[PDB]
Amino acid sequence: NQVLTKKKLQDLVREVDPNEQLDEDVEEMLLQIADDFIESVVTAACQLARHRKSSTLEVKDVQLHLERQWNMWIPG
Amino acid sequence: VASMAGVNLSEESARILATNSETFLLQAPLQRRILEIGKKHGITELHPDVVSYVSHATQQRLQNLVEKISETAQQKNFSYKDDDRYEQASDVRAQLKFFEQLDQIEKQRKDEQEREILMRAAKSRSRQEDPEQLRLKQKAKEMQQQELAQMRQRDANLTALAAIQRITRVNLRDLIFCLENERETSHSLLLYKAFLK
Amino acid sequence: FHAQEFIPFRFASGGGRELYFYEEKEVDLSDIINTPLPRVPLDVCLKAHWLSIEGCQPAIPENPP
Amino acid sequence: TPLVDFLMQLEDYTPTIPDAVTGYYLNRAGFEASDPRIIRLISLAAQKFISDIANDALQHCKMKKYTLTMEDLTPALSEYGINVKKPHYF
Amino acid sequence: PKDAQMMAQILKDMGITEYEPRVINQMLEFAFRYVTTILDDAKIYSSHAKKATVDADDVRLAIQCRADQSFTSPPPRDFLLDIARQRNQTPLPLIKPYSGPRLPPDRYCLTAPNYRLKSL
Amino acid sequence: DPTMYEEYYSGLKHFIECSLDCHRAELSQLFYPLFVHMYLELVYNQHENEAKSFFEKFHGDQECYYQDDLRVLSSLTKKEHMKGNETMLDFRTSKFVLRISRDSYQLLKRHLQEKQNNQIWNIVQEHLYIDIFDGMPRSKQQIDAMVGSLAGEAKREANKSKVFFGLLKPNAPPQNRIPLPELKDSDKLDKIMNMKETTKRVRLGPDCLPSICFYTFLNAYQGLTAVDVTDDSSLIAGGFADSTVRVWSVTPKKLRSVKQASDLSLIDKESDDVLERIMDEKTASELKILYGHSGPVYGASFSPDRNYLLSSSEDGTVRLWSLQTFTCLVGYKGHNYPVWDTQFSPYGYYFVSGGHDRVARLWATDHYQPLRIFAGHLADVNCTRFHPNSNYVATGSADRTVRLWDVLNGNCVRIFTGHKGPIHSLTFSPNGRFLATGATDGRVLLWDIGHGLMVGELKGHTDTVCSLRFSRDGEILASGSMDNTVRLWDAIKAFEDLTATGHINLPENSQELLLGTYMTKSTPVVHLHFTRRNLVLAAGAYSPQ
The domains of chain A are located at 5-76
Q: Do A30 and B65 touch (CB under 8 A)?
A: yes
User: What span, in angstroms and rounded, lies between the C-alpha atoms of E118 and E47?
Assistant: 59
Experimental technique of record? cryo-EM
> CA F226 → CA F44, F132, F238, distances in Å?
40, 43, 6
Q: Select from F434, F395, F394, F437 the least CA-distant residue to F419.
A: F437
Q: Select from A7, F355, F116, F175 the least CA-distant residue to B195.
A: F355
Q: Do B173 and E107 touch (CB under 8 A)?
A: yes
User: What span, in angstroms and rounded, lies between the C-alpha atoms of E105 and A7?
Assistant: 31
Q: Do D82 and C26 touch (CB under 8 A)?
A: no
* 3-class secondary structure, F41: helix
* 3-class secondary structure, C53: strand
Q: Do B3 and D34 touch (CB under 8 A)?
A: no
Cα maximum dimension of chain F: 91
B122 burial (CB, 10 Å; 0-12 / 13-18 / 19+) is exposed
Residue type, F4: M
Residues 6+ apart with CB under 8 A from F369: B195, B196, F334
User: What span, in angstroms and rounded, lies between the C-alpha atoms of F543 and F222?
Assistant: 11
* 3-class secondary structure, A53: coil
Instruction: Mark out the alpha helices in F200-346 (DSSP H runs).
Output: 261-266, 275-278
Closest alpha carbon within chain F to E95: F181
- Which among C46, C52, C64 has the least Cβ separation from residue F217? C46
Handedness of CA F380, F382, F386, F392 (dihedral sign): negative
Closest alpha carbon within chain F to D30: F292
- Cα-based torsion angle of the residue sequence E46, E52, E57, E62 in order, rounded to the nearest 10 degrees: 30
User: What span, in angstroms and rounded, lies between the C-alpha atoms of E106 and F330?
Assistant: 9
- F 171-210 residues with CB below 8 A of C? 208-210
Residues 6+ apart with CB under 8 A from F466: F424, F425, F438, F480, F481, F482, F524, F525, F526
Residues 6+ apart with CB under 8 A from B179: B185, B186, B188, B190, B191, B194
* 3-class secondary structure, F70: helix
User: What span, in angstroms and rounded, lies between the C-alpha atoms of E24 and E4?
Assistant: 7
DSSP annotation of F96: B
In chain C, DSSP finds a helix count (H) and a strand count (E) of 1, 2
DSSP annotation of F101: E
Which of D25, D49, D82, D84 is the best mutation test for C, with the most CBs of C within 10 A? D82
Q: Select from F166, F202, F169 the least CA-distant residue to F472.
A: F202
* 3-class secondary structure, F386: strand
Q: Select from F357, F358, F419, F432 the least CA-distant residue to F388.
A: F432
Which of B105, B114, B173, B195 is the best mutation test for F, with the most CBs of F within 10 A? B195
What is the phi/psi pair of residue D62, to 5°?
Answer: -65, -40
- Which among F264, F334, F369 has the least Cβ separation from residue B98? F264
Question: Where do the DSSP E strands lie in F142-243?
Answer: 212-217, 224-229, 235-240
> CA F373 → CA E89, F93, F364, F402, distances in Å?
10, 21, 12, 16
> CA B130 → CA B123, B125, B137, F475, distances in Å?
12, 10, 10, 44
With beta carbons less than 8 A apart as the criterion, state whether F360 and F374 touch.
yes
Query: What subunits make at least 3 CB pairs under 8 angstroms with B?
Result: A, C, D, E, F
SS3 letters for F509-529? Answer: CHHHHEEEEEECCCCCCCEEE
Residue type, F402: V
User: What span, in angstroms and rounded, lies between the C-alpha atoms of A62 and B3?
Assistant: 20
Resolution of this entry in Å? 6.8
Which of B7, B50, B59 is the best mutation test for A, with the most CBs of A within 10 A? B50
Handedness of CA E94, E97, E98, E101 (dihedral sign): positive
Q: Do A69 and E65 touch (CB under 8 A)?
A: yes
Q: Do B183 and C8 touch (CB under 8 A)?
A: no
Q: Which helix (H) or strand (E) holds F456?
A: strand F454-458
**How close are the terminal C-alpha atoms of chain D, in Å?**
51
Question: Where do the DSSP E strands lie in F323-418?
Answer: 328-333, 339-344, 351-355, 360-363, 372-374, 385-386, 392-396, 401-406, 412-417
> Strand pairing partners for F99?
F131
Q: Chain B closest CA to D90's CA: distance in Å?
A: 31
Residues 6+ apart with CB under 8 A from E59: E38, E39, E42
> CA D50 → CA D53, F251, F349, distances in Å?
5, 49, 49
What is the phi/psi pair of residue F425, to 5°?
Answer: -160, 135
Q: Select from F412, F390, F410 the least CA-distant residue to F179.
A: F390
Q: Select from D65, D66, D90, D61 the least CA-distant residue to D76.
A: D61
User: What span, in angstroms and rounded, lies between the C-alpha atoms of B185 and B138?
Assistant: 59
Q: Select from D49, D34, D58 the least CA-distant residue to D80.
A: D49
DSSP annotation of F251: S
Cα maximum dimension of chain B: 98
Q: Do C5 and D81 touch (CB under 8 A)?
A: yes
User: What span, in angstroms and rounded, lies between the C-alpha atoms of F312 and F326?
Assistant: 16
SS3 letters for chain B? Answer: CCCCCCHHHHHHHHHHHHHHCCCCCCHHHHHHHHHHHHCCCCCCCCCCCCHHHHHHHHHHHHHHHHHHHHHHHCCCCCCCCCCCCEEECCCHHHHHHHHHHHHHHHHHHHHHHHHHHHHHHHCCCCCCCHHHHHHHHHHHHHHHHHHHHHHHHHHHHHHHHHHCCCCEEECHHHHHHCCCCCCCCCCCHHHHHHCCC
Q: Select from D5, D85, D79 the least CA-distant residue to D37.
A: D5
> Strand pairing partners for F518?
F486
CA F242 to chain centre: 25
Residues 6+ apart with CB under 8 A from B99: E100, E101, F324
Q: Which helix (H) or strand (E) holds F435?
A: strand F434-439
Residue type, F486: V
User: What span, in angstroms and rounded, lies between the C-alpha atoms of F89 and F36?
Assistant: 12
Q: Which helix (H) or strand (E) holds F143?
A: helix F140-146
| Total count of residues recorded for chain D | 90
User: What span, in angstroms and rounded, lies between the C-alpha atoms of B41 and F173?
Assistant: 58
What is the phi/psi pair of residue F206, to 5°?
Answer: -85, -5
The C-alpha angle D61, D18, C13, rounded to 5 degrees, equals 65
F514 burial (CB, 10 Å; 0-12 / 13-18 / 19+) is middle
User: What span, in angstroms and rounded, lies between the C-alpha atoms of B64 and F378?
Assistant: 37
Contacts of F293 in chain D (CB under 8 A): 30
Q: Do E77 and F80 touch (CB under 8 A)?
A: no
Interface of E with C (CB under 8 A): 1, 4, 22, 25-26, 29, 33, 37
User: What span, in angstroms and rounded, lies between the C-alpha atoms of F370 and F348?
Assistant: 16
Closest alpha carbon within chain F to E97: F182
With beta carbons less than 8 A apart as the criterion, state whether E114 and B89 touch.
yes
With beta carbons less than 8 A apart as the criterion, state whether F383 and F392 touch.
no
User: What span, in angstroms and rounded, lies between the C-alpha atoms of F406 and F446?
Assistant: 20
Q: Do C5 and B6 touch (CB under 8 A)?
A: yes
Which of B81, B84, B192, B197 is the best mutation test for E, with the most CBs of E within 10 A? B192
User: What span, in angstroms and rounded, lies between the C-alpha atoms of B193 and E10?
Assistant: 36
* 3-class secondary structure, D76: helix
Radius of gyration, CA atoms only, chain A: 15
* 3-class secondary structure, F69: helix
The pairing of strands F339-344 and F328-333 is unpaired
SS3 letters for chain E? Answer: CHHHHHHHHHHHHCCCCCCCHHHHHHHHHHHHHHHHHHHHHHHHHHHHHCCCCCCHHHHHHHHHCCCCCCCCCCCCHHHHHHHHHHHCCCCCCCCCCCCCCCCCCCCCECCCCCEEECCC
Q: Do B87 and E116 touch (CB under 8 A)?
A: yes
Indicate contact of F with A: 3+ CB pairs under 8 A. no
Q: Select from F76, F6, F75, F67 the least CA-distant residue to F35.
A: F6
Which of E114, E119, E120 is the best mutation test for B, with the most CBs of B within 10 A? E114
The pairing of strands B86-88 and E115-117 is antiparallel
> CA F216 → CA C42, C62, D61, F219, F527, distances in Å?
15, 9, 54, 9, 10
Q: Chain E closest CA to F83's CA: distance in Å?
A: 10
Q: Do B86 and E106 touch (CB under 8 A)?
A: no
User: What span, in angstroms and rounded, lies between the C-alpha atoms of D5 and B28?
Assistant: 55
Q: Do E100 and B80 touch (CB under 8 A)?
A: no
User: What span, in angstroms and rounded, lies between the C-alpha atoms of B183 and C5?
Assistant: 9
User: What span, in angstroms and rounded, lies between the C-alpha atoms of F467 and D41?
Assistant: 44
> CA E92 → CA A47, E88, E89, E102, F334, distances in Å?
48, 9, 9, 15, 18
Contacts of D85 in chain E (CB under 8 A): 29, 32-33, 36
With beta carbons less than 8 A apart as the criterion, state whether F342 and F364 touch.
no
User: What span, in angstroms and rounded, lies between the C-alpha atoms of F68 and F88?
Assistant: 13
Residue type, F123: I
Q: Which helix (H) or strand (E) holds D49?
A: helix D36-63
- Cα-based torsion angle of the residue sequence F12, F14, F15, F16 in order, rounded to the nearest 10 degrees: 90
Residues 6+ apart with CB under 8 A from C14: none
F27 burial (CB, 10 Å; 0-12 / 13-18 / 19+) is buried
With beta carbons less than 8 A apart as the criterion, state whether F544 and F221 touch.
no
CB count in 10 Å sphere of residue D41: 18
For chain A, say whether E68 makes contact (Cβ under 8 Å): yes
What is the phi/psi pair of residue C9, to 5°?
Answer: -130, 115
The pairing of strands F360-363 and F514-519 is unpaired
CA atoms within 13 A on the CB side of D34: 17
Q: Do E103 and F67 touch (CB under 8 A)?
A: no
Handedness of CA F275, F277, F279, F284 (dihedral sign): positive
Q: Do F213 and C55 touch (CB under 8 A)?
A: no
Query: What subunits make at least 3 CB pairs under 8 angstroms with D?
Result: B, C, E, F
CB count in 10 Å sphere of residue B105: 16
**How close are the terminal C-alpha atoms of chain A, in Å?**
26
> Strand pairing partners for F405?
F393, F412
With beta carbons less than 8 A apart as the criterion, state whether B8 and B28 touch.
no
With beta carbons less than 8 A apart as the criterion, state whether F79 and F40 touch.
no
* 3-class secondary structure, F417: strand
Burial A33-71 (b: 16+ CB within 10 A, else e): bbbbbbebbbbbbbbbbbbbebeebbbbbbbbbbebbbb
Contacts of D84 in chain C (CB under 8 A): 1
Q: Do D80 and B7 touch (CB under 8 A)?
A: yes
* 3-class secondary structure, F431: coil
With beta carbons less than 8 A apart as the criterion, state whether F481 and F524 touch.
yes
Q: Select from E67, E34, F83, B41 the least CA-distant residue to A48.
A: B41
CB count in 10 Å sphere of residue B26: 16
Question: Where do the DSSP E strands lie in F243-338?
Answer: 244-249, 255-258, 279-285, 287-291, 297-301, 309-313, 317-321, 328-333
Domain positions in chain E: 1-120
Q: Tally B–E CB contacts below 8 A.
A: 71
Closest alpha carbon within chain A to B24: A8
With beta carbons less than 8 A apart as the criterion, state whether F435 and F428 touch.
yes
Interface of B with C (CB under 8 A): 6-8, 11, 181-183, 186
> Strand pairing partners for A22?
B170
